[model samples]
Target: YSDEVLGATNWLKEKSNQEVFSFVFKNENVQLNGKDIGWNSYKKELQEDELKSLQRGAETTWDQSEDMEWETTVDEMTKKQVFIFDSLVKKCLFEVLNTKNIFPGDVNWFVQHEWGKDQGWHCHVLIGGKDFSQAQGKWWRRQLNVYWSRWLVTACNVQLTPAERIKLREIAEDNEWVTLLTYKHKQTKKDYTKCVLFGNMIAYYFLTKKKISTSPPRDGGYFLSSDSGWKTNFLKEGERHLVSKLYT
Candidate 1:
């Protein structure tokens, strides 16, 4: 009876998740391809392509300007600065991917941005390719490690002490956190844990969730009183250009 109870609970949890996803995908306000199409419609459009067995995954906490020191206000950045920041990040991301010969054009991809804990913006890219989806568990983890290390180090071309740069390099190369994770979904079979340098499917959910906001509430809605420079959801035209580059 105990085992049966547990199984029933798990089924309800999975069903709940499915319903939530379906609701979000059908919402008309969800944006895709610079238009007001629901996520399901966008996904269906992608399915029209040849690659049918695409897997979903994401990475997080990838700040290109990590070496720079910021003021306490955090919210002082102007629209121009924001655009430049986004452009640099987009360029660096594609450059790193190209260097690894992992061109997304052949595979189909979507890169979405969100603020990290430090208010630093990061991207969550969805990769849709059968080659990656069908890769061996260990192989996938190894490649992810390599890709992360390369991108992290490559994007660190800002002001940094020699010691600081060395430490960053060490962190990039370290993979002690990698572990095997069993899954109930048969399509994934087995996957690896998110190492310090890499991310996982949970990150993907955060990126695509319905209620994403980069700004803080105007009227002290939460406990934190400090306006930590996180009050702008609207991107400028130039910033939108940078975002478009990721899709192209």
Candidate 2:
């Protein structure tokens, strides 16, 4: 057979050693209103080919697709029709928090929903470059420390004002309802409260072209996806910081 398996193992290894983007945090638990409706994403193992059983580990973003189209995001509607807020505009809106600011390269986000229901149209903005962990992240945990998980709740509530704050669990004992609470990262051996990344990178893997030699960049672990909890989303797939207009 002309096909090979170990080619990517070295290439991915080389790129990893040659690159160093120093912005990452531990994945901790984020259980608000006792629901595991958390967020995260990353480059994990390649989806194996069903027919050929081949690993798609070596695909790069270009080989992946530029079709990531400058897409927009969420909001809501009325409960009578069961709809949440969503804008008719292509670009979304962002409200300034009464307290703080932004970052250098790491991506971060925070979203909240209604009545413990698994449904709602909420806005999520991913600001890339050393973000949240610098400002609110500390304020989030500063009040209660490890309550960082619970701390996120009050943080999300700031915009709503006291009249709209939804009820969160009163005690830690309510954690009995916690399912898929956190994942024990197989590689890092750390537990992330949330798993299953936010974007559709691997799904577009069909467009992947063999850019490198038969020696592919086969590292299966994902840099774009971190096991860290309640922090910003990290993507180690590039070089230098992406800062201009305002920054992510």
Candidate 3:
């Protein structure tokens, strides 16, 4: 979700003005590749068409006895799961950084997730209306350790440290643009406890620096490590290998 929005924003900015609203507005003189721009049409026409096709594809597979026939359920479930997770990540970061954890500035957030035939999963998140040039690293570190850590412990029941919490508080004192991201992979099979990290200058700064009770990054670039077990590495790695082969 986060990745897609940033990618789109970057598409508009690099192609037009560096302003998100300007891109949305399709304002005059906002030239991209030496022409006036329009995204509303592209979104309403092209993107919506693609989404409709996806919806159709999912619905067409509702009746097979095999698990593969569950496309509609899988697609919707994955979307909802990622959306909830994305919300939690943003809320944690906001609480830690802004001390105003209650949905800052109507900034848009989205979640996108991928699921494998064998049931493996990974997710992407994007933060909008925010830049992180000056304080990306520090703020992210604190957001993960302090605000997120407490949330993880309290809500997710994942254990984190007091030192981690303190570090986040210190980072929140500074002001900067808001472009931060979090990545998560479902590490375990049952509970789906993910190996999560934020993307700033220092990727995986949380798992690498702070000690948590959950597992760390191992299989598939996205999943979280579990408290008691791991998802089948064979299945995840195989899916990854196949995708790499097909794409490359």
Q: Relative to the true structure, how large is the alpha-carbon lDDT of every model? A: 0.29, 0.22, 0.29
Clashes in candidate 1: how many?
Answer: 0
For every model shown, what is its TM-score relative to the native structure? 0.35, 0.21, 0.30
| CA displacement after TM-score superposition, residue 175 of candidate 1 (Å) | 6.3
Who is ahead in lDDT, 1 or 2? 1
Stretches of candidate 2 above 4 Å error? 1-100, 103-128, 132-248
Q: How do the residues 29-143 of candidate 1 rate in per-residue lDDT, one tens digit apiece?
A: 2222343322112121123111221111111111221212432222323222233323333343345446557664543233344343342333333333333332344444444
In model 1, the runs with Cα more than 4 Å from the true position are: 1-104, 116-121, 136-151, 175-248
Compare the candidates by TM-score and give the number of the best one. 1
lDDT by residue for model 2 over 164-204, one digit each (tens)? 33333233213321122233568768544322222221112
Q: How many residue pairs clash in each candidate?
A: 0, 26, 17
Against the true structure, what is every candidate's RMSD?
18.6, 17.2, 20.1
Q: Give the C-alpha miss distance for residue 69 in model 3, angstroms.
A: 12
lDDT accuracy of residue 199 in candidate 2: 21
**Which pairs of residues collide in model 1?**
none
lDDT of 3 by residue, 14-40 (tens): 322111110000001123334332211
